[PDB]
Swiss-Prot record:
Gene designation per UniProt: dctP
Protein's name according to its UniProt entry: Isethionate-binding periplasmic protein DctP
Main location: periplasm
GO cellular component: outer membrane-bounded periplasmic space
Pfam families, per the entry: DctP
InterPro entries (UniProt xref): DctP_fam, TRAP_DctP, TRAP_DctP_sf
A biological process term (GO) from this entry: transmembrane transport
Deletion consequences: Cells lacking this gene lose the ability to grow with isethionate as the terminal electron acceptor.
Protein family according to the UniProt entry: Belongs to the bacterial solute-binding protein 7 family.
Lineage: Bacteria, Pseudomonadati, Thermodesulfobacteriota, Desulfovibrionia, Desulfovibrionales
Keyword Signal found: yes
């Protein structure tokens, strides 16, 4: 008989992550001649990122996708990815290869297995960049004393404080109002999201700080995966790997288009000098020490090895 597999995620129609999951669904049905069907539950239809991931861990749902920062709720080891300047866009190809094929990908599988999960796709999300409403930012010093919106992420807060900024955690839904009303001076996020949410309407300045990286992790319940016939496991594995090839590339293209949209809307986008980049790196490096007790040195090293 048919195998029906539920996949919950929090993302909206047309989003880079949502569309990777559509390709995954398509590829599963092709490779299986229709025997296996992924049923998509996007847009938090089955609950928040956290609720649907816990369902996947406990086995009341087959698959779910969570952002790498939210995965830190299940194991703080996932914070390795959030550490400021642990990776940079220059080296992304080597990062993907390590995650997909390498010792890094093996270590992550171990971590996922310890919390009841099997990784299927490490969907690209991308790098966050600082933006402001009124205060020109072109250098690392321009950041000092900025009131900046953050999420609840510990690393986000510490990065802001390390740079001399005053972090204010504000929910996403409240952030546009806060910028418009001036309770914060700026934020840090992807160009794609800022453009898609039209934060660009209130922003005037951007720098290519690339000070945080994230992914969206599609996981299957490990016991469920282990209960499947080898040919089905391989279909899922292959489909996720193949879907990821497109999703990674689509994400890059969308980010380029978003940056173009910033410039078309009159936003000044400053490409930081080597000197200024070096200042952001060195100012934020002390954050790693604040979090190293929950992040194994071996995992940090594996990620670092992808950047050389």
């Amino acid at each position: 008989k048919r195998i029906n597999i539920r996949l919950a995620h929090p993302m909206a129609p047309g989003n880079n992550v949502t569309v990777g999951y559509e390709k995954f669904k398509e590829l599963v049905a092709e490779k299986s001649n229709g025997r296996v069907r992924i049923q998509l539950f996007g847009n938090c239809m089955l609950g928040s990122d956290r609720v649907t991931m816990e369902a996947a861990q406990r086995g009341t749902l087959e698959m779910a996708s969570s952002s790498s920062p939210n995965m830190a709720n299940f194991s703080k080891q996932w914070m390795v990815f959030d550490l400021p300047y642990i990776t940079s866009p220059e080296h992304q190809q080597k990062l993907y290869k390590a995650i997909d094929d390498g010792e890094l990908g093996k270590k992550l599988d171990e971590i996922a297995a310890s919390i009841g999960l099997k990784p299927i796709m490490y969907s690209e999300y991308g790098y966050r960049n600082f933006v402001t409403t009124k205060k020109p930012i072109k250098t690392a010093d321009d950041l000092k004393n900025l009131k900046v919106r953050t999420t609840d992420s510990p690393i986000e807060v510490a990065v802001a404080a390390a740079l001399g900024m005053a972090p204010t955690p504000i929910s996403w839904g409240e952030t546009y109002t806060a910028l418009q009303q001036g309770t914060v001076d700026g934020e840090g996020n992807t160009f794609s999201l800022l453009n898609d949410a039209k934060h660009t309407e209130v922003l005037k300045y951007a720098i290519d700080s690339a000070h945080n990286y994230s992914m969206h992790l599609l996981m299957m319940n490990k016991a469920y995966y282990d209960s499947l016939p080898a040919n089905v496991q391989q279909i899922l594995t292959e489909a996720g790997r193949e879907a990821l090839t497109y999703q990674r590339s689509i994400t890059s293209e969308l980010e380029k288009k978003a940056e173009d949209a910033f410039i078309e809307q009159g936003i000044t986008v400053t490409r930081l000098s080597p000197e200024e980049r070096a200042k952001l790196v060195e100012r934020t490096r002390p954050v790693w020490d604040k979090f190293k007790d929950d992040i194994p040195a071996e995992l940090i090293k594996l990620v670092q090895e992808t950047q050389q």
